[PDB]
């Protein structure tokens, strides 16, 4: 009995985020593609400048 | 995590433990105890 | 390390990823100012533990997730029994009755009677010369 055993040795990142809103989110951009998303904004690659 | 210490990062095989814990346990030695009894009745009675 | 030789590892090379904590873009503490979450607490490098971080920046990531609930308990008083208390102030904290079992390094005593018995017993054995 008890509980599962858990291996710490393998990082989960959806166990430190306890809020919904923080975790990235791959979802449908009508504009093109898909993007990620979060309440932190869309994850974006550095331009030239 | 003032006792971070006390958890394990790897997984516990906790049957294991409580198998090792009966492994090396003291030996209530009841079926020598029942046969010794038997013995020393019948001496007793239908011996002696 | 300390915070100088932090500082010049950080501005020697401002992209490296463990001094990307210490100094990071205005882009991200403007959001999480935005947000109205301190960006230490979620920003990825952050977390890294290879990641150094001074004093200031340590101390103030500790305030990052934290309860602020308290139990006053009174007199407590159990007997034959188990108690545990858990300071879940219902924070999606499944209700846990995992018993922790251990290594019994249980040593055996041994059935050694008192050698100090050595003495009387040989007394038992001295009383068969009455039986003669």
């Known amino acids: 009995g008890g509980t599962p055993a858990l291996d710490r040795r393998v990082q989960d990142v959806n166990d430190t985020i ?7 989110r791959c979802v449908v951009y009508p504009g093109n593609g898909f993007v990620s998303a979060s309440i932190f904004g869309f994850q974006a690659e550095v331009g030239p400048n | 995590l003032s006792n971070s210490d006390r958890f394990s990062t790897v997984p516990v095989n906790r049957a294991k433990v409580v198998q090792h814990n009966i492994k090396h346990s003291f030996d209530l030695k009841l079926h020598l105890i029942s046969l010794l009894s ?5 001496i007793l009675i239908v011996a002696i | 390390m300390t915070d100088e030789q932090i500082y010049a590892f950080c501005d020697a090379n401002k992209d490296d990823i463990r001094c990307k904590c210490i100094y990071p873009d205005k882009s991200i503490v403007r959001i999480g100012i935005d947000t109205r979450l301190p960006y230490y607490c979620w920003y990825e490098p952050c977390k890294r533990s290879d990641a150094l971080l001074p004093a200031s920046l340590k101390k103030n990531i500790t305030k990052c997730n934290v309860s602020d609930c308290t139990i006053s308990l009174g007199n407590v008083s159990i007997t034959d029994s188990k108690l545990d208390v858990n300071n879940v102030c219902d924070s999606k904290r499944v209700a846990t009755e995992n018993i922790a079992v251990r290594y019994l390094n249980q040593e055996i005593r041994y059935p050694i009677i008192d050698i100090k018995w050595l003495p009387i017993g040989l007394l038992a054995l001295a009383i068969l010369i009455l039986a003669f």
């Open chain 2, 38 to 42: 038997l013995l020393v009745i019948w």
């Open chain 1, 18 to 24: 306890s809020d919904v809103k923080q975790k990235w």
